[PDB]
Amino acid sequence: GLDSHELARLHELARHSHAVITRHQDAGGAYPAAPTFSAYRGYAWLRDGSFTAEGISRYGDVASAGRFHDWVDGVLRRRRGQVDDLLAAVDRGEVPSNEGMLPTRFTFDGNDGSDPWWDFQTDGYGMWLWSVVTHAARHGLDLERWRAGIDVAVDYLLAFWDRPCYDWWEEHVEHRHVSTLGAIHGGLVAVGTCAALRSAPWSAATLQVAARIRSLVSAEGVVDGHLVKWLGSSAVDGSLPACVVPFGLVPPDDDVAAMTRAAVAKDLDVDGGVHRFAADVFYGGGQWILLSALLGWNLAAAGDTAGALRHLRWIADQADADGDLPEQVPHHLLHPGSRAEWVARWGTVATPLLWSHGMYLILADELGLLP
């Protein structure tokens, strides 16, 4: 379904995606979110980094992906005491405030880059577990290299998975977001079904808590046959397909998977460019490359190769003259009046966004299109 013209350009964008990710990887192994965007530069996120690492692992750069996992593992081992103290506090009946939780932004030397009162999120820890297990399985690696960091993440998530937190988009701290629950589920199932981790003391617990997550989503996170943005809401969010692939709340051919893909397409997908959520005013609510990639990935997994390809083509059309992929583009805006202020305050949209490139690599790989 691709001619030589398209294949050449898609191959080149894949090569360039690998290059921009590995060029900007920090000396210590972290992947930055966006080296030139004012509000993100200097920081690493586990969410962005884990998807980026998965794209790089699929691409076959074992060294680069391994250095990212080394970095995360070391950062988490340094939080062993913090996590133990949070768990002890829970055991005393003194539940820690959001202000005491593990961070969202990391500096490249592994310190808190932001105050979790303002951005507390648990999804990234779940994504990292999914990412590191998937990487090790793909390349035949011994997970003991990263196990002590895995242990910190697992202990943290088993304790705090059911806590309200901000969503992937740093909004609505009072709610429990289905793509956050989904990320945690994906990480817990990854470690709980990993033969190398069969003797871990938390082995059984991870699958039991994953089942608890699915119970909660079944009870409060499905409406009219589709997943919803947060428990007790009716709306969808463009992140929701991640709950199918890769995080596995339901199989790709499940009715809830089909209905969720359809609802996201209807409510949020304009010409192949997927919006985050209807109320999104960030840069006027533009079309997000990573979300078009996520939807494409899910379409491919469900057997809709044509739909996957249409989304891959849309993404490729957003590459700039150097091949860099932005965070988002404004071809369609949900709330156009809101864009100007964002541009004035933070500058033009983050480009390149490493996560855009990571997701491009994943979707290209799903379609068998890596060079």
UniProtKB/Swiss-Prot annotation:
Entry GO terms, CC: cytoplasm
Organism: Kribbella flavida (strain DSM 17836 / JCM 10339 / NBRC 14399)
GO MF term list: hydrolase activity, hydrolyzing O-glycosyl compounds
Protein known as: Isomaltose glucohydrolase
Entry similarity comment: Belongs to the glycosyl hydrolase 15 family.
Active site: 167, 170, 327
Thermal behavior of activity: Optimum temperature is under 35 degrees Celsius.
Gene3D superfamilies per record: 1.50.10.10
Enzyme class: hydrolase
